[PDB]
Write a protein that binds this DNA or RNA. Structure first.
Lengths: 513, 475
DNA sequence: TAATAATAGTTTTTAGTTTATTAG
DNA sequence: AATAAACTAAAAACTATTATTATG
């Protein structure tokens, strides 16, 4: 999409609102540049010393400083935000900031398409304010549609802060309403957790095909990549040692004949295969006809069984598909809904022979529906081939006369289980709540990568980017369950022996430490 | 794992299986077994020895005993040697250079088999012998039975079915021994593995750990990697390949490799060392977080195939005891273990659910759901994907009832191993045909084409009757 | 002075390179 | 200008394998 965001900051440093505002704006801009979102942002500085306004409407706009117009951020912009912007001394007026912000927006709306509009104003409300131009500012707000994400230091605020709070909540309820009160947050805490960690999103595309239930009776369907082990968007670029570009960098082979220095070229190779004691020659041109021929992007379903026979253990593949119908095909949609309701009622799972396209591979798959009040479709997971069914005989454990847990150990384990429950127990309100929801936490590898990137970028001489402790906080459960299980841990360690281990991995070498 | 199963094929030549003739499908089954072995496992050994002929080709030079293939890894040349006698003209030429039925002694053939078994210079896990004859031939019988008993005591297994069909002719071999239809290439492109995954430590808390044996059970199969054989000599090249200096000329070095990502304004140039150290977060193992109910699962968040977890009483003793206790507790508890798991160094952690895997021994004591736990990957926030809203229309009770009647008419038991990959099967068949200088072997769909295309009339299709839209929904 | 130590090269996975359909 | 069949390095173990320091 596209977003239009304006920035405004609140002497001016009086903890200090200036430091929190600078921290949050630097964090926001670094998150934008790391996510590489396609949206430009504008920066306006009201209250900074000096009347350097872009447009001087009678010099009524005091201390208005448009540091940056609506432009795509970069590392240069982030360091400019870190360095150049310093607190002012004389109070400014909110009307000037709003008027200049929407003037910049209107100037920048000519030339660039925008799919979203936002406003990010930060003020301690200690600056003197006058409420005289409500009509024009509210008209501009409802025209430019800049969704105000305003933030406050925090109530026991001062009279100037009280008047600022009441005018801002009045203008929000006039414009937006309750959400206008909601979008106002504290400079710390709420805003601190709002943008401390980022996320990434790689959008997939529909799989417009036909569900072939039966010989004919096909049903138009569209499928999407639902759950996927995410990969990094950008791979590392191996650049030159000193040029730092791609001049002496290339991937190439020699294909020297195993001899005495004779070599071979690409046309000289044959794609043989190790047929046991020897290698039979073979070529891709031979593969062209000596290969299975698929039939387009078929969605052939072949079998139906009970949900009991299948196993969550036997869930294979590397992706998940929400099997939806096609676009606005009401007959197909209701037919699919009836079919999935029938399958759910009978617990009657389906077997699907899937192929992504003509060049794809046949894929046996299990089909069972998912039903919610917001989305209703079918879930598809790749079923195995009998080659995948690896078998390894294992000795029984419940009959281990040599290792039989004592009943004291059993009760200690019970106490441990009860203490380290990581989910809220379902009370009379059905409070089956995940105290440690893993699915809502992004992969820490990417946040660590971006932390290292900023560490090296903003300071090229900084050798080692440290691990974020907040990641450890995200990577560790609340200490309540740990403290509860501490005593059961003591019981277990007293009730369970062990012997020594090996493979003591060490650092590369023992330099000065 | 060291040691394999040794099977040797012994077939009588007594001009009684020459009359389809028992010799014919005996040779066919031997060829099919050899093909299945060469496509399945190469560490095994095969041997072909015949007796009763007019020639005495064997190490100790015993009468009527002919050896053709000794104990060795399966090879295409052995397949061609078998095939040259497969036909009826092959049968007669075989009888020519080998000799028709003649006098012999089962003691001698068992002695030759024992010598051949001793000839191998490897630890050989199991020793089995397959023998073929139409009727039992048998003095000679006493010594033969005594020698057979001695060999059975030495650790030799025997196998045989009379080639008349029923259960009529095994009289002279009732005690000698301790069905080939399934061996007629019914299994193809089998894969066999014996190793195990990397054993780790279960970091359940800050001080005590459990030596856990990791086991993959359903890992994805794939075709063997191709080799870059030469065009004429048909042998691979040394494949020398590494970046050197081209723009400036010369040779590049690993120390010269700088990595960067052009982001925004500038390219953040770094080296590899930062890249690997970025991937490092903790030590290998499973750092336990706690327990979470199995009911608290999204039921549709599979991303990587599950891996079995087993005790390994080799580094701590508490593995077996504590795992048995937990599995006993897994009866009462439906909560699942939450663990931060890293297979090895420099790996980002993944949250792991330990679904209780309790052993379910059947009448034959099949290790269904082996005793332990399976690793269940839990997706991150970024692993989730957005989904456009869709709450257009519901279904009607009439429609759901009609769909129920349509679907439950057709039900399947869903045998797990009932399907194999058509691509891999066709690839193996093509390699087999090329290795034997033949035509296209065959095409056999692994039920990929639904069988419902012909039995839809058999199940009484009714959705064709029930076209809910006047305009054909299936245009 | 007449043992067990670190020890190669196995396969086996596992993560990082390449050509078809959306955007103009 | 995205996803994915289809190659391409790379990192444990299950096997043989050798230097201890056994002693004048």
């Amino acid at each position: 999409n596209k977003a239009a965001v304006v920035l405004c900051m609140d002497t001016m440093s009086n903890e200090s609102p200036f430091e929190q505002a600078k921290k949050v704006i630097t964090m926001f801009v670094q998150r934008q540049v790391f996510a590489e979102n396609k949206d430009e942002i504008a920066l306006v500085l009201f209250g900074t010393d000096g009347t350097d306004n872009p447009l001087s409407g009678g010099d009524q706009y005091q201390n208005i400083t448009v540091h940056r117009h609506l432009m795509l951020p970069d590392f240069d912009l982030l360091e400019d935000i870190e360095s150049k912007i310093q607190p002012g001394s004389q109070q400014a007026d909110f009307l000037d900031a709003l008027i200049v912000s929407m003037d910049v927006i209107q100037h920048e709306t000519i030339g660039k398409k925008f799919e979203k509009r936002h406003i990010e104003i930060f003020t301690d409300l200690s600056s003197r304010f006058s409420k005289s131009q409500l009509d024009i500012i509210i008209h501009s707000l409802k025209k430019c549609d800049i969704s105000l994400q305003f933030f406050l230091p925090f109530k026991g605020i001062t009279e100037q802060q009280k008047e600022g709070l009441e005018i801002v909540k009045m203008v929000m309820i006039s414009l937006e309403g309750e959400d206008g009160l909601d979008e106002i947050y504290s400079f710390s805490e709420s805003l601190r957790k709002l943008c401390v960690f980022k996320k990434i999103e790689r959008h997939s595309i529909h799989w417009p095909c036909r569900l072939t239930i039966g010989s004919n009776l096909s049903i138009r369907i569209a499928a999407y990549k639902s759950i996927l082990q995410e990969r990094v968007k950008k791979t590392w670029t191996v650049v030159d040692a000193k040029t730092l570009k791609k001049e002496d960098i290339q991937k190439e082979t020699v294909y020297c004949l195993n001899d005495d220095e004779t070599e071979v070229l690409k046309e000289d190779i044959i794609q043989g295969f190790r047929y046991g004691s020897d290698i039979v020659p073979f070529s891709k041109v031979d593969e062209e006809q000596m290969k299975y021929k698929s039939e387009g992007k078929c969605f052939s379903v072949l079998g139906f069984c009970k949900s009991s026979q299948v196993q969550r253990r036997f869930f294979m593949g590397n992706q998940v598909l929400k099997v939806f119908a096609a676009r606005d095909d009401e007959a197909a949609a209701v037919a699919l809904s009836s079919l999935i309701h029938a399958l759910d009622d009978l617990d009657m799972v389906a077997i699907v022979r899937y192929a992504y396209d003509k060049r794809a591979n046949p894929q046996v798959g299990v089909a069972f529906p998912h039903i919610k009040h917001n989305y209703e479709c079918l879930v598809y997971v790749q079923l195995p081939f009998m080659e995948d069914l690896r078998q390894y005989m294992f000795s029984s454990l419940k009959n281990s006369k040599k290792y039989a847990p004592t009943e004291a150990q059993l009760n200690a384990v019970d106490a441990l289980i009860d203490s380290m429950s990581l989910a809220k127990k379902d009370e009379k309100t059905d409070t089956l709540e995940d105290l440690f929801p893993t699915t809502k936490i992004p992969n820490p590898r990417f946040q660590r990568l971006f932390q290292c990137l900023l560490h090296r970028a903003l300071h090229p001489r900084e050798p080692l980017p440290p691990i974020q402790q907040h990641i450890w906080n995200m990577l560790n459960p609340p200490a309540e369950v740990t403290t509860k299980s501490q005593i059961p841990l003591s019981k277990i360690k007293t009730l369970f022996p062990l012997i020594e281990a090996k493979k003591k991995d060490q650092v590369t070498a023992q330099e000065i430490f | 794992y060291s040691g394999r199963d040794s099977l040797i094929f012994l077939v009588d030549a007594s001009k009684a299986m020459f009359e389809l003739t028992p010799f014919d499908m005996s040779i066919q089954c031997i060829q099919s077994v050899y093909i299945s072995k060469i496509i399945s496992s190469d560490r095994d050994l095969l041997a072909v020895v015949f007796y009763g002929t007019e020639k005495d080709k064997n190490s100790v030079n015993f009468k009527n005993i002919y050896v053709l293939q000794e104990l060795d890894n399966p090879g295409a040349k052995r397949i061609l040697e078998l095939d040259q006698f497969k036909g009826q003209q092959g049968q007669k030429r075989f009888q020519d250079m080998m000799g028709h039925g003649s006098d012999y002694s089962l003691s001698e053939v068992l002695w030759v088999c024992a010598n051949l078994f001793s000839d191998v210079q490897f630890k050989m896990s199991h020793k089995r012998i397959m023998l073929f004859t139409n009727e039992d031939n048998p003095a000679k019988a006493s010594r033969a039975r005594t020698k057979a008993g001695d060999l059975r005591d030495t650790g030799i297994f025997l196998d045989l079915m009379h080639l008349k069909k029923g259960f009529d002719i095994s009289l002279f071999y009732r005690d000698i021994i301790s069905k080939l239809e399934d061996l007629l290439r019914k299994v193809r492109a089998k894969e066999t593995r014996k190793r195990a995954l990397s054993r780790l430590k279960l970091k359940l808390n800050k001080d005590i750990v459990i030596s856990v044996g990791i086991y993959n059970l359903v890992q994805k199969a794939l075709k063997p990697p191709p080799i870059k054989l030469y065009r004429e000599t048909n042998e691979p090249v040394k494949t020398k390949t590494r970046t050197f200096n081209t723009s400036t000329g010369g040779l590049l070095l690993p120390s010269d490799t700088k990595r960067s990502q052009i982001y925004g304004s500038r390219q953040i140039i770094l080296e590899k060392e930062e890249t690997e150290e970025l991937k490092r977060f903790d030590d290998p193992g499973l750092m336990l977080m706690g327990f979470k109910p199995l009911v608290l699962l999204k039921k549709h968040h599979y991303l990587r195939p599950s891996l079995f977890v087993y005790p390994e009483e080799s580094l701590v003793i508490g593995s077996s005891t504590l795992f048995s206790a937990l599995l006993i507790k897994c009866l009462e508890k439906e909560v699942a273990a939450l663990c931060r798991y890293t297979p090895r160094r420099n790996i980002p952690p993944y949250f792991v659910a330990l679904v209780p895997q309790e052993e379910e021994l059947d009448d034959q004591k099949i290790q269904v759901t082996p005793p332990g736990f399976q690793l269940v990957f839990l997706p991150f926030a970024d692993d989730k994907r957005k989904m456009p809203f869709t709450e257009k229309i519901m279904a009607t009770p009439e429609q759901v009832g009609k769909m129920k009647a349509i679907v439950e008419k057709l039900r399947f038991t869903y045998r797990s191993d009932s399907f194999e990959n058509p691509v891999l099967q066709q690839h193996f068949r093509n390699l087999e045909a090329l290795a034997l200088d033949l035509m296209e072997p065959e095409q056999a769909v692994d039920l990929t084409l639904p069988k419902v295309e012909a039995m839809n009339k058999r199940l009484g299709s009714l959705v064709d009757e029930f076209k809910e839209l006047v305009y054909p929904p299936d245009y």
